Each structure stands twice: as C-alpha cells, then as structure tokens.
Ligand binder design. Sequence first.
Ligand SMILES: O=c1ccn([C@@H]2O[C@H](COP(=O)(O)OP(=O)(O)O[C@H]3OC[C@@H](O)[C@H](O)[C@H]3O)[C@@H](O)[C@H]2O)c(=O)[nH]1
Ligand SMILES: *[C@@H]1O[C@H](CO)[C@@H](O)[C@H](O[C@H]2OC[C@@H](O)[C@H](O)[C@H]2O)[C@H]1O
Ligand SMILES: [Mn+2]
Lengths: 298, 35
Amino acid sequence: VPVDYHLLMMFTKAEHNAPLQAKARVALSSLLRLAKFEAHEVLNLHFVSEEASREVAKALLRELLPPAAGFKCKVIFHDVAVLTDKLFPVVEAMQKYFSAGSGTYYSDSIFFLSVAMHQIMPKEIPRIIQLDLDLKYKTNIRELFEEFDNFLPGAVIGIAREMQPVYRHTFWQFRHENPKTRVGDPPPEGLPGFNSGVMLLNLEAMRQSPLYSHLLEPSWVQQLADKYHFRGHLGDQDFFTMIGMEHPELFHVLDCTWNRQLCTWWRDHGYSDVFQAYFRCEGHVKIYHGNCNTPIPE
Amino acid sequence: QCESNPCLNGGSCKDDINSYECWCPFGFEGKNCEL
Ligand SMILES: O=c1ccn([C@@H]2O[C@H](COP(=O)(O)OP(=O)(O)O[C@H]3OC[C@@H](O)[C@H](O)[C@H]3O)[C@@H](O)[C@H]2O)c(=O)[nH]1
Ligand SMILES: *[C@@H]1O[C@H](CO)[C@@H](O)[C@H](O[C@H]2OC[C@@H](O)[C@H](O)[C@H]2O)[C@H]1O
Ligand SMILES: [Mn+2]
C-alpha cells in the first residue's frame, strides 16, 4: 500500500538568478543524496514557481534524478499566480502587518502560503514539510517526518526557534510596556519567535483546529497585531511568531539542529551583547540554513 | 524585500515613509544607527 511523503519549496524568479540556482542545487543535491525511503514509499517534491522557474527547476532536477538511493520520487509544480489568487482572500488582512512594507500587494501574498496551506493543497495531502532552498541537508529527510508524531494535542505546526534577536527588536514596544515578558527573550526560557526555513505543516490538524481557524480571521489578526504593536516584513514567519506568543500550544518546537540558521546580521546591528544567547545551537546538525545569503560551511 | 529598519520605532523597513524619528538600539547613533 503506497505511502506518500510531501515536501514543498518556493522557487520563483530563478531565471538569470545564479545565486538562487546555486542554492537550490546545494539544497536539492544534499537532500536527494542522503534521502532513504522504503520500497512502497514515494517522495513528492512540490515546487511553487512561475513558468520560467519551472523550466529552470526541471533542468536542475533531471541532473539529480533518479536519486542514487533508487526510491520513487515524483515532482509537482504549482503556479505561483494560481496560488496567489487562492491565498489572497484568507491572507489579505495580515499582509499589512507582515509584508515589506505597506499596504496590501498581490506580490506579497505568496509569502503567506504556509499559513493557509491547508486550504490550498488538496485534502488528500494530510501533511507537508515546507523548506527553504538555501539549506543543506546533513541527514535523511525521512527522519524529519517522525517529528509529526511528537505533536501534542492542539498543535498544528512544527517549527524551530529564530536564532537571532530579530523579535527582541520587533517587539520592543510590547517589551517596554511589559518589562517582565518572555516575548522576544532568548531560550531556554524566553520566546525568541520562529524561523520559517523548515516547517511541518500538519494540514489535517490545521483544518481541524477551531483556534487556528479563528486566528486567520481579519479581526483576530488585527487585535493581536495591536496588542503586540507588531510590524514585520518576513511574512508567514512573522504571523506564526506573533500567534506563537499568544498561543504557544499551536506549535511543536523543533530542535535547533533541524534548522541551524547561520545569519548574523542582527549581531552587528545593535545586539552584540545578547546575540550569543539566541544563536547558540548544539548537538548533531541535521539541516544548515544559510539565511541572509550566508555561505554554508562544509 | 526590504532592509530591516535598524530603528526601534516606526515600520519594519528602513526609511519608513511614515517615520521621522529613529530610536537606535543602545550603543548606536545616526539616521541609520550607523555609528
Ligand atoms: O527570489 C526568490 C527569493 C526567495 N525564494 C524562496 O524563498 C525562500 C526565502 O528566501 P531566502 O531563503 O533567500 O531568505 P531567508 O532564509 O533569509 O528568509 C528570510 O527572508 C525572507 C522571508 O520570507 C523569510 O520568512 C525570512 O526568514 C528561499 O529559500 C527560496 O526557496 C525564491 O524562490 N525566489
Ligand atoms: C532585517 O533586514 C536584514 C537585511 O536585509 C535581513 O538580513 C534580516 O533578516 C535576517 O535575519 C532575520 C531572519 O529571520 C532572516 O531569515 C534573515 O534573512 C531582517 O531581519
Ligand atoms: Mn532561507
């Protein structure tokens, strides 16, 4: 009885963008080199792309497939334009809070895809892992799927913490008005917010959660953004971070080794002292994330 | 995308059109908290 595994990656504006293509190459080669799946299993690779990037991705993929490990792999493309239009009704009201900069543009809607993925993917897909393309996999991606099993009651999404003090900065006013808050503080005891590079989207649990459905409503988005005095430009990452402050029950926090972020931009922009408490990650690394164009070591 | 606003107030992008003041994180000065 065939068992499907689903990954989704954004791959847009990739034509004449050599840096993006090279990242995609590093991510997809390491992914496929180290992947291992049983005989009846199939790895479905979903790409969100406009037509030029679909062609770029196809040329890259033919070079990498079939995988050395010989397992079944299926490639699927989703039109960024089609998805944008399906997303917009759900996602419109949050855009003004979490998009560069204001107000509400179609071009920003796709950065909220994860938040409404359960309404975009067919109901036959119960779970999907959304992954950035500036990653490098140091293990078998099949192992990430067992983290779905660790979701507690009410949890809908698996996500790793943000490893820079960006949300310490973003939540300044709320932190100012609430000296004792954990919002924006480093781990192990603070809520530093989330990074969107690796996300376990339990589409069934998202669909089936009354709480999660309410938070998507325009008035709830507005109430919380006002409560937290919150403004961002990182899209889905900012929305999850915010509702994560109100309702941490919704999120299964992945260990930092599943999304080891390398970006240090915030260290050199006012946070030298505290930076280390946010950025510390130890253990055997599973995925490196070369965010803010940070070279990944080897 | 946009460059993060180094200022503590105003929008999330630097040179937020609706912002005039720039309150810099401790130890930094200037219109872009440069020095
Ligand atoms: O032009 C692009 C840019 C980005 N992307 C995709 O979107 C992902 C996000 O961009 P990058 O990975 O370069 O950026 P970062 O990892 O620094 O992410 C950061 O900035 C962008 C925000 O949307 C993220 O939420 C934030 O963490 C890429 O991995 C890639 O899969 C494209 O397909 N085309
Ligand atoms: C502020 O702007 C800078 C410069 O454009 C970005 O590099 C910052 O984003 C980076 O740090 C926060 C992480 O969540 C992002 O993934 C990373 O690109 C931005 O906060
Ligand atoms: Mn990334």
